[PDB]
Write a protein that binds this ligand. Structure first.
Ligand code: NAG
Ligand code: CL
Ligand code: CU
Ligand code: CU
Ligand code: MG
Ligand code: MG
Ligand code: O
Ligand code: O
Lengths: 325, 325
């Protein structure tokens, strides 16, 4: 990155953070023109720049050399014995669209002495999607109810040239849609999971005006303000859960791995509140709740797809996403 | 004997199994016994073209059989046109047929096929004849090497078969998306036949003027270019760039096709600069030529050999430009 956890910054330096500055300053690399830092030199702005994603794919490939160095998972590594994913379906069509969102610009302008504010807003078009629900039918033949981790990914079927991808060529392209822990009772049952409840996403932030109104209303009148209804600001926006897709529709693989929740949460508390964004943003003030490597079970090479196909607790199905312009 | 039936049959026989000595005994007899110099009254030029060609043949100056032929090769073209010139002077079909049979057995097959085609097209004796498609007369020039090899295998094993052609390149090559345009066998016949109908070597002393040829040269190629770009637009591609003598040719090409005699067609790598071609031209010569043509366009006149102006600010100007380009 590097962080202050680095055991040897004198030798390994700070590749990623220095790269942000190297890239950000390429419009004036010698300071001759006195230009200010580039968009890459703030986390507020870095993703606006196309080169952000070229830099971060470069960095991602460094990590991938390490993750690719481990032996592929075996059947015995992956099997959650007695747990079979019988079916994966979605209740509701997968549909994206653009809608409009407003935020205040008042703090950007200069207010005089004794000059009344006027409302000044920006309106942006933003991606969004319709609500849907996963229906994951699972057969538990273990003999007792068991905690399971449900890991949900969206994977490309073909590339932009129309070439069908192998699982090994898909896995590093898959995007995480959800991760959750749920007790699966003995027998056959359908788990339902709302798109709204994804542990990858958080809702749009409340506006500054709304926070002022709610705080002021609570303070005025001796009313206990409680905002325990809102989430953290870390997390993919809920509205961006799905890729845009195409008006003609595109098909993707919806990949579901159901894994041993006891093993995954050992040393923690599996059936406890982990907040709404633990997949990539963790749990405020607590240990990370999932012991598996990030990306499990897609983070190692899969040279032989037969291994995955032979594991009853892994299943993928084809889903279609349609963009409404 | 001059009936359309017999003329068509004669042409069919002359073009059959073109890489081997004729298998038709009547054509064999003509090739053995006919004397192109034996009756000057056969010809509208009192026999001159026949004398010219027979002298080259008797002096052993003609390209051997079983050898590649290119119309763009000056000497090979000159030889093909010597045979065209004989056929073009024949007054009656038996002169045309007998000279064609005679020289079929003496001349390079590529030269012979070319001369016979343009001879039929440009002689009134050819009226009513339908020329066989060149993709069945010289299939190597229209068929990728893999399919030719299967045909060779079918012949080696004496087993009939029909083999599927499936476009050059891979799906990773975006240019393959539009291979169905330039590789279409009929599009290639369109192109060769246009040039046979309107040859750059035409002189009106051959018998007639080719009206507006230089402007039709502009137009037919403008339409090929515009039609190709419509296929690119249909396939999510941008329009083609224009070539520049001082800039890279981005898109290479592997024909995966072979001559019957001469070997495989050569590949061009992606992203290469033009190099001087020994025996043809320097790249800089192409730039100078281009500059001189643009000088005429921007002057509004072409410069004659003695320096006087040839006005092109008139409707024939585009035709005169086609003539010089
Ligand atoms: C060739 O194409 C035909 C029709 O498209 C098909 O029936 C046949 O199986 C193909 N042969 C091969 C070897 O693909
Ligand atoms: Cl149920
Ligand atoms: Cu970064
Ligand atoms: Cu042409
Ligand atoms: Mg021969
Ligand atoms: Mg030149
Ligand atoms: O970043
Ligand atoms: O970052």
């Amino acid at each position: 990155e590097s962080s202050m956890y680095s055991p040897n910054a004198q030798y390994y330096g700070s590749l990623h953070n220095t790269a942000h500055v190297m890239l950000g300053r390429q419009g004036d690399p010698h300071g001759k023109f006195n230009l200010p830092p580039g968009v890459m030199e703030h986390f507020e702005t870095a993703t606006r720049d196309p080169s952000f994603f070229r830099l971060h794919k470069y960095m991602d490939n460094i990590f991938k050399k390490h993750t690719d160095s481990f032996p592929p998972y075996t059947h015995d590594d992956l099997e959650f014995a007695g747990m079979a994913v019988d079916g994966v379906a979605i209740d509701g069509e997968l549909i994206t669209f653009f809608d409009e969102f407003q935020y205040s610009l008042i703090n950007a302008v200069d207010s005089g002495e004794s000059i009344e504010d006027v409302e000044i807003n920006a309106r942006v078009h933003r991606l969004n999607h319709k609500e849907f629900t996963y229906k994951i039918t699972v057969s538990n033949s273990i003999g007792s109810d068991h905690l399971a981790t449900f890991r949900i990914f969206l994977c490309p079927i073909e590339d932009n040239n129309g070439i069908t991808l192998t699982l090994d060529k898909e896995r590093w392209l898959c995007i995480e849609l959800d991760k959750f822990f749920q007790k699966v009772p003995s027998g056959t049952h359908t788990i339902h999971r709302s798109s709204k409840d994804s542990s990858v996403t958080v809702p749009d932030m409340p506006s500054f005006h709304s926070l002022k109104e709610q705080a002021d209303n609570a303070v005025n009148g001796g009313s206990d303000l409680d905002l325990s209804a809102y989430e953290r600001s870390c997390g993919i926006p809920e509205r961006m859960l799905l890729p845009k897709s195409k008006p003609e529709g595109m098909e993707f693989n919806l990949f579901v791995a159901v894994t041993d929740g006891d093993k995954d949460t050992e040393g923690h508390n599996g059936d406890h509140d982990h907040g709404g964004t633990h997949a990539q943003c963790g749990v405020h003030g607590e240990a990370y709740p999932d012991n598996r490597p990030l990306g499990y079970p897609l983070e190692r090479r899969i040279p032989d797809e037969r291994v995955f196909d032979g594991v009853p607790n892994i299943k993928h199905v084809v889903v279609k996403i349609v963009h409404h312009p | 004997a001059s009936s359309t039936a017999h003329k068509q049959q004669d042409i069919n026989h002359l073009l059959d199994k073109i890489y081997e000595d004729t298998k038709y005994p009547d054509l064999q007899e003509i090739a053995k016994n006919f004397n192109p110099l034996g009756d000057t009254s056969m010809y509208n030029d009192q026999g001159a073209a026949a004398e010219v060609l027979m002298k080259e043949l008797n002096d052993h100056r003609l390209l051997e059989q079983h050898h590649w032929y290119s119309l763009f090769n000056a000497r090979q073209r000159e030889e093909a046109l010597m045979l065209f010139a004989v056929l073009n002077q024949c007054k009656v079909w038996y002169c045309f047929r007998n000279n064609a049979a005679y020289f079929r057995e003496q001349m390079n097959e590529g030269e012979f096929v070319y001369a016979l085609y343009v001879g039929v097209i440009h002689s009134k004796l050819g009226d009513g004849i339908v020329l066989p498609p060149l993709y069945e007369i010289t299939p190597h020039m229209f068929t990728n090497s893999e399919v030719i090899d299967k045909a060779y295998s079918a012949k080696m094993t004496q087993k009939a078969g029909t083999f599927n052609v499936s476009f050059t390149g891979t799906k990773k090559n975006k240019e393959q998306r539009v291979a169905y345009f330039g590789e279409d066998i009929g599009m290639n016949i369109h192109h060769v036949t246009w040039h046979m109908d309107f040859p750059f070597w035409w002189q009106d002393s051959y018998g007639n003027h080719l009206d507006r040829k230089g402007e039709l040269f502009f137009w037919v190629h403008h339409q090929l270019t515009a039609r190709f770009d419509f296929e690119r637009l249909s396939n999510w591609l941008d329009p083609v760039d224009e070539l520049h003598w001082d800039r890279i040719i981005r898109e290479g090409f592997a024909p995966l096709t072979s001559y019957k005699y001469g070997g495989e067609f050569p590949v061009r790598p992606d992203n290469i600069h033009f190099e001087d071609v020994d025996g043809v031209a320097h790249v800089h010569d192409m730039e100078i030529t281009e500059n001189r043509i643009y000088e005429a366009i921007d002057h509004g006149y072409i410069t004659a050999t003695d320096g006087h102006t040839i006005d092109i600010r008139q409707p024939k100007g585009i035709e005169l430009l086609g003539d010089i380009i």
